[PDB]
Amino acid sequence: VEVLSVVTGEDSITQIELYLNPRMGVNSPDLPTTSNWYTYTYDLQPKGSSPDQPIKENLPAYSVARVSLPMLNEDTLQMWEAISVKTEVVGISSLINVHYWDMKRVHDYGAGIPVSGVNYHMFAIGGEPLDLQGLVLDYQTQYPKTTGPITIETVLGRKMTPKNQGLDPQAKAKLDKDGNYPIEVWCPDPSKNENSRYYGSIQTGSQTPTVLQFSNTLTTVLLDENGVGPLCKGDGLFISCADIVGFLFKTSGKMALHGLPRYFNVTLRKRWVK
Amino acid sequence: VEVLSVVTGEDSITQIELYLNPRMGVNSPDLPTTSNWYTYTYDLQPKGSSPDQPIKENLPAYSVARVSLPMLNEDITCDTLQMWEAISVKTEVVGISSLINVHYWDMKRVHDYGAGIPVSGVNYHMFAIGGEPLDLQGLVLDYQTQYPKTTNGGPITIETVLGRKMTPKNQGLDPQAKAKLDKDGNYPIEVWCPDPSKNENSRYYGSIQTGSQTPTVLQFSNTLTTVLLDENGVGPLCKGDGLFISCADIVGFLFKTSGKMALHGLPRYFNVTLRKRWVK
Amino acid sequence: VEVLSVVTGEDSITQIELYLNPRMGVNSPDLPTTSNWYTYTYDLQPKGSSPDQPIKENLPAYSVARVSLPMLNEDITCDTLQMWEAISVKTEVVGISSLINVHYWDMKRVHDYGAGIPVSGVNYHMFAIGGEPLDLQGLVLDYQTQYPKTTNGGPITIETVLGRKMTPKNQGLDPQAKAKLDKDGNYPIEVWCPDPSKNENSRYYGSIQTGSQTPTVLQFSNTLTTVLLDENGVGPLCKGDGLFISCADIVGFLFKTSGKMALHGLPRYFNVTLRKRWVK
Amino acid sequence: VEVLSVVTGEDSITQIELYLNPRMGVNSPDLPTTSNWYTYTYDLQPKGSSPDQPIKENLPAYSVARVSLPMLNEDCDTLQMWEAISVKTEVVGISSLINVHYWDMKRVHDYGAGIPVSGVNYHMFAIGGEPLDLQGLVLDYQTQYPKTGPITIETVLGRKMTPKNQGLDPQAKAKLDKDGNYPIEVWCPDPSKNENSRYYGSIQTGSQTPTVLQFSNTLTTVLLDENGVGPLCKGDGLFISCADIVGFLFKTSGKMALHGLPRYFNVTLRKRWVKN
Amino acid sequence: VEVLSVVTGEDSITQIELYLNPRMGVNSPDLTSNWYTYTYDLQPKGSSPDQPIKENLPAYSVARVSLPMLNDTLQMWEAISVKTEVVGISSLINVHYWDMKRVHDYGAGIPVSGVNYHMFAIGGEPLDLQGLVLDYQTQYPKTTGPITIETVLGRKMTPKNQGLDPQAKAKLDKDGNYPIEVWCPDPSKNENSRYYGSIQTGSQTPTVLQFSNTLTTVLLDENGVGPLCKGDGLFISCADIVGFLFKTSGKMALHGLPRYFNVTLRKRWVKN
Ligand SMILES: CC(=O)N[C@H]1[C@H]([C@H](O)[C@H](O)CO)O[C@@](O[C@@H]2[C@@H](O)[C@H](O)O[C@H](CO)[C@@H]2O)(C(=O)O)C[C@@H]1O
Ligand SMILES: [Cl-]
Ligand SMILES: [Cl-]
Ligand SMILES: [Cl-]
Ligand SMILES: [Cl-]
Ligand SMILES: [Cl-]
């Protein structure tokens, strides 16, 4: 796909807006029986015996949407090119709440321990699904069958081996389904993703402060070193993210991970391609 | 709503000054018996049983003022009019030095015979400058929280705007959970955040810091200026000759001897520079 | 006060050097009995009953000096005069290296048989350069605090300036609670902060860090310069040929064996570059 | 070598990609007997009596590869060399560290989640036209490292360390020419050499210090020096080196093992004329 | 001394390389030397006075480098840039020192962490030092032997030495002899030196250090002039305390690392 000139003319620029709700394990608000924990995992707890058999509710997964863009070609073609994005984690202020009814206290008579600890923040803008690389802390982990999360065993069609604690070139997938690819199993593949831009960070520790910023004045430019943004194949724009904001500390000692939604406003332009 | 050229002339630039005192829950210094806790919450505690029924005094809220600006147009019926355009702001959290006090009479000690635990832990800092009220998005930690009813003197929360009880979706982004920041000390911080899908005509800047005893780390200087112009060189345009200024500055917990903890906020000062702009 | 052109000619630039020793509460090294605690407070403790009646030795205060500058105008009744304009400063906290000492005889050991807990915790750092005294705003953690009443002109607190008791509004920003930083070691840091609504003719820069054992993290280099010019390229103009220099540098607690804790301060050095400026 | 002009022409620029798996002590995934701990050390403990006699599985080492480049010269004292000009590099598998439910993970408190991988971090990478020059320096010169096996100061000196090896001993030098063989706690990059390499690193100590890492495919490191010259690949070999210790796995018993992650590289190179 | 033009010529630039080993208290590896690059155990006594031993007083490292001789108007070497690096940073991943205090039962050793102090200086003459101490009642060993404030004053310290006493001044002219806890760079002098430093206090505060051979520090002042080497001597000074070694008993010792320098100098015309 050879990249030609930017299309000149009236309706050459467009804007795409959307938000993605977090897929922490309880992924739907519409199941009365368990939806009270929507945007959280269940309780995360080392079993103390082998092997680990994590349940789907304890496996935060990436959020993804494919956005359909205005059709460009009737019959060398025009493609939408993503050039910038404004993105924001929404609901940050909710985390000042230190009086959840079942919050573990910092000490006797004190306030709740605020949401804190492990953070994981990433977003990606691309013209096709984000490429994923599989790597796990423990290859002996027995993830649930797709029946359900997509894990390394799913893509290999056989059990993990010790090499899956490192980089196994065969352990690859595409982020093509919302709330189905666990964060603990899949990371962005730096060996591919030529047609995506991704940005991420992690923070470990149990009670490490959650420190986050928000402003409507911040823009990320999506152009590469040659001045070309992601090109949207088949008029589809892929947007991916994850925003783990820390643990909810419960009175019993039990802890669950929590996530927040993310907002996007992407600017695109028409580009001639060969 | 076409933006035209900047107005040229002698009195084309004006400077507006204000301060906003914090609205942490005890929101008035003038109450008969309870005002000693002005700029603080009451004691924040998990109930231990469901549901949470938090009191007003435990719900820090946004500060907001509308500033009336000099009237610009002798004829309001014209297509082309002059509007005040906010171009920069100098803003400072006031009273930062007060937080070196480690000898509050009822302060929990760091250890036996030691000084008090200094104000520390949860921080939340934000300010916004707009030509109209700041747009808010509702999202809460726990949808089952029973906030005091607005009709009973309570704050404005999600149930208020929906006309019905929250559902689990309000733990995520619900597009119906929206409001405008149009009342000082009535929109709880733990319920409302700036709405990034709107606010075309505002600029906002904010941060959070969680943890229980996390150091409060703040700077102050009269040399720092925030430029309010967007990518096109246009600042917020003041509709009806009104400038909207919003903020929140939670600076941490006061740790009391018994173990009880209350949040504390500080005031914020603003000096906004505005210029006259022709608009169609 | 119309600012004209920078003066041209041979000796149009001058340099002013000084240092300011900290005023932590024990403010003199020349007292027979108590001067061992020079650069420290006494022991800081919550009283445990109301009200707090803090002693002067527990109230770190701002340092300040007024430097007399060379006289410039033979005839002071002329409309157009030369004034010294402060354009840049090199400033440094002195004695930072002294804080590696973890073997002070009465230092609390971190754990059994260990090294002393080093000077750490609450930090407060600020400096200002101005052509007049720094403008101060009063705000306190607790309005019920009973600060010392003296006959010797210090410490000056909100009650001192108001001529009446504080009220709850003094936990926020009370526009009547204002003062000028015109006396060395007399204005308590926990009561007074720089007033961002004034200070047009000064530049100030500060920060706080709370927490009990938070690392003290400081830099020093003789290569760092602060430019004092505002947006128009004008520095503070020295009224009456006087340069005002103010600062505070609390660097943390000395943790004593008994559990007691005292705040500690370090001195600050300044080298200010000034130029002659025509003003009308 | 005197550096002449950048070669002009159609195929004067090439790209090289590769990944390096971590060599934390259990260095192979292909030994059914012990490979379950691949990318970790064994349990790290003070012996409690002198001397320390660490096992190889407790000595994280540098990763290294020599990448063979296309042959440039059919020959003359004037020739072409590959010049590395930029690199995109990324630590892979960062997301794996959100796992706080490893079956034998020490809990933060009763009934809580596992203590996340945290504590000691050491991160470095190097790109060079020859092996990275190493300087030896150890915490304790009386440490008895396993005989070569890992290469340590005793190996290169052909005699026992002395106290001077707790500081900089100019005799304690090596070249990073073998994957997984040079212990990190013994060897660091030698700033007195490495004219033909570029290296970047950091350390973080503490026991439970947050592991804080970033990843983006938009970040490029420029490898040109102050004269606009990148590393020049002697004998058409490109040397890539790294280490990425990401913290401790805290086990239920109290035991602790260090953990590492792999690193990816995409290096851009151009043809450069050189003399001698 | 009037600074004239930069000398233009074939051999007008030179590079000076050196390293300085740390002087933490046990300052020689050629003796007790098992503790080279460390202090002895640092421990508040609990009773007065404090009479610290010389092995518990980390001191600045310094070298005078003799430069190639060049000569009212003469040439001087002018230091224009430096690449400097703390050596041996990787050694600090060792959490299995045989006598290391454990983080908890069955755990690894507490890594080297806590108090850090990092500084370097490049000058055309000795670094100017200012004396200031935590406690004027500290009784430092007599010079026979570190140089301290009592050494320079010729009389005991008074309370004023907890602040800035303009009489408490010295020149950093001897390696391993000027205690870090007594002396700091004098910002009121040092016109012909450039210095850079930081401190981090705390007991177990993470040691966070960087290393790269791509980082350069420009030594030129605001007028484009670097330090000028009087009598053809370049002064290089540093200190790099990297934290505590935590021992099983509870005792703690400070530890330092060496520092490497590569200084670029050029010839400069000057007038005396
Ligand atoms: C928001 C507020 O005023 N909080 C008080 C708190 C309340 O008065 C509460 O309703 C009563 O506990 O009381 C605090 O002080 C306590 C005393 O009132 C009580 O008699 O004895 C307690 C210790 O045994 C304690 O001193 C509290 O609970 O900490 C103070 C707090 O500001
Ligand atoms: Cl993160
Ligand atoms: Cl914050
Ligand atoms: Cl500070
Ligand atoms: Cl690191
Ligand atoms: Cl430091």
Whole-angstrom CA distances from C8 to B69, C13, C82, C229 are: 43, 10, 11, 18
DSSP result, chain A = --EEEEPPSTT-EEEEEEEE--BSS---S--TTTGGGTTB-------SSSSP---GGG--B-EEEEEE--------EEEEEEEEEEEEES-GGGGG----TTBPBSSTT-PBPPSBS-EEEEEEEESSPEEEEE--S-TT--PPP------HHHHHTS---GGGGS--TT-EEEE-STT-SBTTTEEE-TTS-TTEEEEEEEE-SSSPPPEEEEETT--EE---TTS---B-GGGEEEEEEEEEEEEEEBTTS-EEEEE--EEEEEEEEEEEE-
Contacts of C117 in chain E (CB under 8 A): 203
User: Please, how many CA atoms are within 13 Å of residue D14, restricted to the half-sphere of its CB?
Assistant: 19
Contacts of C197 in chain B (CB under 8 A): 17, 19, 269, 271
Yes or no, beta carbons of C124 and B219 under 8 Å apart:
no
| Technique used to solve these coordinates | X-ray
DSSP result, D13-75 = EEEEEEEE--BSS---S--TTTGGGTTB-------SSSPP---GGG--B-EEEEEE-------
Nearest chain D residue (CA) to A185: D96
Is there a contact between D190 and D173 (Cβ–Cβ < 8 Å)?
yes
Paired strand residues for B156 = none
Other Cβ atoms closer than 10 A to E271 = 10
State how far the Cα of C255 lies from the Cα of C43, in Å rounded to an integer.
Answer: 10
Q: Which helix (H) or strand (E) holds D156?
A: helix D153-157
Question: Left if phi > 0, otherwise alpha if psi is -120 to 50, otherwise beta: which for B170?
Answer: alpha
State how far the Cα of B13 lies from the Cα of C219, in Å rounded to an integer.
Answer: 40
The residue assigned the tokens 């070249």 is D175
State how far the Cα of B269 lies from the Cα of E147, in Å rounded to an integer.
Answer: 51
B43 lines ligand 1 (CB under 6 A): yes
The residue assigned the tokens 């955040």 is B193
Looking at this protein, which amino acid is placed at residue A230? P
How remote is the C-alpha of A40 from its chain's centroid?
14
Work out the end-to-end distance of chain D between its first and last CA atoms, rounded to an integer number of angstroms.
5
- Breaks, C-N > 2.5 A, in chain A lie after 75, 147
Cβ-proximal residues to E43 (8 Å cutoff; 6+ apart), any chain: C103, C109, C113, C114, C115, E251, E252
- Give the DSSP letter of residue C29: S
The residue assigned the tokens 């054992």 is C213
Strand, helix or coil for residue D235? helix
B258 lines ligand 1 (CB under 6 A): yes
Cβ-proximal residues to E165 (8 Å cutoff; 6+ apart), any chain: E131, E132, E149
Other Cβ atoms closer than 10 A to A20 = 24
Q: Which residues surround ligand 2, an ion (CB under 5 A)?
A: A 119, 121, 201, 203
State how far the Cα of C143 lies from the Cα of B39, in Å rounded to an integer.
Answer: 11
State how far the Cα of A217 lies from the Cα of A88, in Å rounded to an integer.
Answer: 10
Work out the end-to-end distance of chain A between its first and last CA atoms, rounded to an integer number of angstroms.
6
Q: In total, how many domains does chain B have?
A: 1
State how far the Cα of D218 lies from the Cα of E226, in Å rounded to an integer.
Answer: 38
The residue assigned the tokens 């009386």 is D142
Strand, helix or coil for residue D259? strand
Enter the tokens of residue C267. Answer: 């001195």
Q: Measuring from atom 19 of ligand 1, which residue has the nearest CA?
A: B258
Ligand 4 center from residue C147 Cα (angstroms):
25
Residue A241: closest CA among A136, A138, A90: A90
CATH number at residue A211: 2.60.175.10
Looking at this protein, which amino acid is placed at residue E59? A
CA distance B265 to chain A (A): 13
Q: How many residue pairs bridge chain A and chain D with CB atoms within 8 Å of each other?
A: 188
The residue assigned the tokens 């070298």 is E63
Q: E152: buried, middle or exposed (CB in 10 Å: 19+, 13-18, 0-12)?
A: middle
State how far the Cα of A46 lies from the Cα of B246, in Å rounded to an integer.
Answer: 45
User: Please, how many CA atoms are within 13 Å of residue B124, restricted to the half-sphere of its CB?
Assistant: 28
Other Cβ atoms closer than 10 A to A136 = 23
What ligand 1 atom has the least distance to the C-alpha of A109?
28
State how far the Cα of E205 lies from the Cα of E191, in Å rounded to an integer.
Answer: 34
Q: Is the peptide bond before B51 cis (omega within 30 degrees of 0)?
A: yes
Is there a contact between C232 and B133 (Cβ–Cβ < 8 Å)?
no
- Give the DSSP letter of residue E231: G
DSSP-H helix ranges across chain B: 158-162
Phi, psi at D116, each rounded to 5°: -65, 155
Other Cβ atoms closer than 10 A to C152 = 7
Question: Left if phi > 0, otherwise alpha if psi is -120 to 50, otherwise beta: which for B221?
Answer: beta
State how far the Cα of A121 lies from the Cα of A92, in Å rounded to an integer.
Answer: 13
Nearest chain B residue (CA) to A104: B46
Yes or no, beta carbons of E34 and D245 under 8 Å apart:
no
Contacts of A242 in chain D (CB under 8 A): 95
Question: Given CA atoms B150, B154, B160, B165 in this order, what sign does their dihedral have?
Answer: negative
What ligand 1 atom has the least distance to the C-alpha of B41?
1
How remote is the C-alpha of B157 from its chain's centroid?
15
State how far the Cα of C58 lies from the Cα of C264, in Å rounded to an integer.
Answer: 11
Residue E117: closest CA among E35, E207, E11: E207
State how far the Cα of C267 lies from the Cα of A236, in Å rounded to an integer.
Answer: 63
Cβ-proximal residues to E199 (8 Å cutoff; 6+ apart), any chain: C96, C97, C99, C100, C216, C217, C218, E115, E116, E117
Q: Is the peptide bond before C155 cis (omega within 30 degrees of 0)?
A: yes
Other Cβ atoms closer than 10 A to B111 = 13
Q: Which chains touch E (3 or more CB pairs under 8 A)?
A: C, D
Is there a contact between E133 and E147 (Cβ–Cβ < 8 Å)?
no
State how far the Cα of B220 lies from the Cα of C136, in Å rounded to an integer.
Answer: 13
Residue D96: closest CA among D264, D265, D260: D260
Enter the tokens of residue D250. Answer: 């805290």
Other Cβ atoms closer than 10 A to C165 = 11
Contacts of D40 in chain A (CB under 8 A): 165
B256 lines ligand 1 (CB under 6 A): yes
Cβ-proximal residues to D270 (8 Å cutoff; 6+ apart), any chain: D6, D7, D12, D13, D14, D82, D83, D85
Enter the tokens of residue A256. Answer: 């669950």
CA distance D161 to chain E (A): 11
Mapped to the 3 state alphabet, what secondary structure does E62-104 carry? Answer: EEEEECCCCCCEEEEEEEEEEEEEECCHHHHHCCCCCCECECC
Largest CA distance in chain D: 73
Other Cβ atoms closer than 10 A to B150 = 14
Cβ-proximal residues to D35 (8 Å cutoff; 6+ apart), any chain: A162, D26, D28, D29
Paired strand residues for D64 = D241
Is there a contact between D263 and D90 (Cβ–Cβ < 8 Å)?
yes
Whole-angstrom CA distances from C257 to C117, C251, E43 are: 10, 19, 12
* CB nearest B116 (choices: C46, C193, C258): C46
Paired strand residues for D39 = none
- Report which bound ligand comes closest to the CA of A121: 2
State how far the Cα of E23 lies from the Cα of E147, in Å rounded to an integer.
Answer: 14
Contacts of D211 in chain A (CB under 8 A): 202-205
Is there a contact between C70 and C241 (Cβ–Cβ < 8 Å)?
yes
Is there a contact between A114 and B230 (Cβ–Cβ < 8 Å)?
no
CA dihedral A96, A100, A104, A107 (to 10 degrees): 60
Is there a contact between C95 and E160 (Cβ–Cβ < 8 Å)?
no
Is there a contact between D40 and A140 (Cβ–Cβ < 8 Å)?
no
Is there a contact between E143 and E223 (Cβ–Cβ < 8 Å)?
no
User: Please, how many CA atoms are within 13 Å of residue B248, restricted to the half-sphere of its CB?
Assistant: 33
Residue C99: closest CA among E105, E178, B172, E180: E180
State how far the Cα of A28 lies from the Cα of A102, in Å rounded to an integer.
Answer: 22
Residue C147: closest CA among C162, C131, C125: C162
What ligand 1 atom has the least distance to the C-alpha of B57?
1
Enter the tokens of residue C151. Answer: 């006959």
State how far the Cα of D30 lies from the Cα of C62, in Å rounded to an integer.
Answer: 67
Whole-angstrom CA distances from B6 to B235, D211, D240 are: 11, 50, 56
Nearest chain B residue (CA) to C50: B105
- Report which bound ligand comes closest to the CA of E92: 5
Contacts of C219 in chain E (CB under 8 A): 197-198
Q: How many residue pairs bridge chain C and chain E with CB atoms within 8 Å of each other?
A: 192
Whole-angstrom CA distances from C25 to A216, C37, C262, E40, E161 are: 46, 9, 10, 35, 17
Is there a contact between E60 and E238 (Cβ–Cβ < 8 Å)?
yes
Residue D18: closest CA among D69, D83, D72, D89: D89
Is there a contact between C90 and E173 (Cβ–Cβ < 8 Å)?
no
Tallying the residues shown for chain D, one arrives at 276
Enter the tokens of residue D120. Answer: 């000691």
Residue D93: closest CA among A176, A134, A201: A134
- Give the DSSP letter of residue D165: G
State how far the Cα of D81 lies from the Cα of D237, in Å rounded to an integer.
Answer: 10
DSSP result, E178-222 = SBTTTEEE-TTS-TTEEEEEEEE--SSPPPEEEEETT--EE---T
- Report which bound ligand comes closest to the CA of A244: 2
Residue C272: closest CA among C209, C230, C226, C215: C226
Yes or no, beta carbons of B208 and A207 under 8 Å apart:
no
Resolution (Å) of this entry: 1.9
**Domain membership of residue D189 as a residue range:** 1-276
- Breaks, C-N > 2.5 A, in chain E lie after 31, 71, 144
Q: Which helix (H) or strand (E) holds E165?
A: none
Instruction: Quote the Cα angle for B241-B246-B248, to 5°.
Output: 170
DSSP result, A36-101 = GGTTB-------SSSSP---GGG--B-EEEEEE--------EEEEEEEEEEEEES-GGGGG----T
Q: Is the peptide bond before D51 cis (omega within 30 degrees of 0)?
A: yes
Is there a contact between E126 and D173 (Cβ–Cβ < 8 Å)?
no
CA dihedral C45, C48, C54, C55 (to 10 degrees): -60
State how far the Cα of C156 lies from the Cα of C147, in Å rounded to an integer.
Answer: 9
Is there a contact between D6 and D81 (Cβ–Cβ < 8 Å)?
no
State how far the Cα of D39 lies from the Cα of A164, in Å rounded to an integer.
Answer: 10
Is there a contact between A37 and A256 (Cβ–Cβ < 8 Å)?
yes
Give all strands (DSSP E) within B200-241, no chain letters.
202-209, 217-221, 226-227
State how far the Cα of D135 lies from the Cα of D148, in Å rounded to an integer.
Answer: 18
- Give the DSSP letter of residue C31: -
Other Cβ atoms closer than 10 A to E4 = 13
Ligand 1 center from residue C52 Cα (angstroms):
17
Whole-angstrom CA distances from C33 to B154, C36, C264, D120, E135 are: 59, 7, 19, 48, 15
User: Please, how many CA atoms are within 13 Å of residue C174, restricted to the half-sphere of its CB?
Assistant: 25
Pairing of strands E259-271, E73-86: antiparallel
Strand, helix or coil for residue E159? helix
